[PDB]
Amino acid sequence: QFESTAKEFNKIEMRIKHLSDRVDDGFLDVWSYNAELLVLLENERTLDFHDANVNNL
Amino acid sequence: DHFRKEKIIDMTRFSDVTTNNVDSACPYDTNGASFYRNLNWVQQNKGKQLIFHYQNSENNPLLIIWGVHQTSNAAEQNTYYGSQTGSTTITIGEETNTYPLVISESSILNGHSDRINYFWGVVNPNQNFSIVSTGNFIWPEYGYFFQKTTNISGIIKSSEK
Amino acid sequence: YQNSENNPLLIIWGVHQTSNAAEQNTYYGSQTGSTTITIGEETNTYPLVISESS
Ligand SMILES: *[C@@H]1O[C@H](CO)[C@@H](O[C@@H]2O[C@H](CO)[C@@H](O[C@@H]3O[C@H](CO[C@H]4O[C@H](CO)[C@@H](O)[C@H](O)[C@@H]4O)[C@@H](O)[C@H](O[C@H]4O[C@H](CO)[C@@H](O)[C@H](O)[C@@H]4O)[C@@H]3O)[C@H](O)[C@H]2NC(C)=O)[C@H](O)[C@H]1NC(C)=O
Ligand SMILES: *[C@@H]1O[C@H](CO)[C@@H](O[C@@H]2O[C@H](CO)[C@@H](O)[C@H](O)[C@H]2NC(C)=O)[C@H](O)[C@H]1NC(C)=O
């Protein structure tokens, strides 16, 4: 989806700003963890893919 | 997708009052005393009531910005407006916004113990707005016709060009 | 009033904002009229407001 930077609340709404801050923290943790293990899993499978092709010749 | 300044109110049609009032807290590039281009400061209402009506016959919503003057004391209120009154009700479509007269010192900033507080609203196409004021009002002489876009971006804070 | 029921009670009220002194006088016969409604320990106070609207 279209990414936005409008994340500002007024001076007496710091709690809403904190909610916005932790919402972005949550997605940061979700994407970081999924991205790390995606690359780790696929790299192990890619090397196995080459081994299978060599064995198949 | 579109953004035009236009003139929305002919300020010359209000009688027994002064318009285009200025102040040294808002100089031009030279120096001196000026004021916001789109906002017209009206003084010396003298308790008299002013009425204005408008209809957005444009095919785009209209953004208007106004201000309400909070004076420091009875003397300052008397000098600017000549009456211990001055209250504005601005109606946009079906909302009503009422700004009763408020007199109170504040700490002095830019040589001002008084304040002008700014508000805004959106007049949709074929919708109306009206102003009833007895003083202490800064009129939305100019406004911006604009076209909304769905994807919201925000503000980039940087010193770069 | 005391809610002696075994369920919470939802109540809805309204506060009248009159247009002018004449309209205030016709409806209530006095240039006053203020309501304080207390629920448990909150206090809600609605002072008289007189002002035209569209
Ligand atoms: C507000 O923000 C959103 C998000 O950024 C924007 O929405 C995106 O808009 C673009 C362009 O309008 C969309 O991309 C287009 O998707 C079409 C559908 O793709 C699916 O189906 C095709 C098969 O028909 C698959 O190949 C594809 O993988 C998808 O499964 C495509 O048909 C479009 O193809 C266009 O580009 C190719 C080259 O890349 C050309 O060859 C084509 O001829 C064609 O021109 C295109 O890919 C995108 O999907 C939208 N995303 C979302 C989340 O909405 C809004 O546009 C934006 N608003 C404004 C005003 O900018
Ligand atoms: C917005 O303002 C216009 C103009 O005052 C209102 O339309 C007019 O209504 C009178 C009757 O009171 C008619 O005689 C005019 O012919 C109307 N003018 C137009 C251009 O239609 C309109 O009703 C107002 N809108 C709302 C919601 O009050």
DSSP string, A14-47: HHHHHHHHHHHHHHHHHHHHHHHHHHHHHHHHHH
- At least 3 CB pairs under 8 A between chains C and A: no
> CA B41 to CA B158: how far, in whole Å?
33
B128 pocket-lining for ligand 2 (C-beta < 6 Å): yes
Q: Which residues pair with B160 in a beta bridge?
A: none
- For residue B23, the one-letter residue type is D
Q: Are B67 and B138 in contact (CB under 8 A)?
A: yes
Location of structure tokens 């031009």: B28
3-state secondary structure of A49: helix
> CA B99 to CA B93: how far, in whole Å?
17
Looking at CA atoms only, how far is residue B149 from chain A in angstroms? 12
CA atoms within 13 Å, Cβ hemisphere of B144 = 13
Q: What is the 3-state secondary structure (H, E, C) of chain B?
A: CEEEEEECCCHHHCCCCECCCCECCCCCCCCCCECCCCEEECECCCCCCEEEEEECCCCCCEEEEEEEEEECCHHHHHHHHCCCCCCEEEEECCEEEEECCCECCCCCECCECCEEEEEEEEECCCCEEEEEECCCEEEECEEEEEECCCCCCCCCCCCCC
Q: Are B132 and B54 in contact (CB under 8 A)?
A: no
From B59, B54, B57, B55, select the one nearest B2 (Cα to Cα).
B59
Shortest-distance Cα residue to atom 17 of ligand 2 = B55
Experimental method: X-ray
Q: Among positive and negative, which fits the CA dihedral C24, C28, C31, C34? A: negative
> CA B101 to CA B99: how far, in whole Å?
7
CA atoms within 13 Å, Cβ hemisphere of C27 = 13
Check B151 against A2: CB less than 8 A apart.
yes
Q: Which residues contact B115 (CB under 8 A, 6 or more apart)?
A: B69, B70, B106
> CA B98 to CA C51: how far, in whole Å?
8
> CA B88 to CA B70: how far, in whole Å?
12
Q: Among positive and negative, which fits the CA dihedral B74, B77, B80, B81? A: negative
From B87, B98, B96, select the one nearest B129 (Cα to Cα).
B96
Q: Are B103 and B71 in contact (CB under 8 A)?
A: yes
- The domains of chain B are located at 1-160
> CA B147 to CA B59: how far, in whole Å?
9
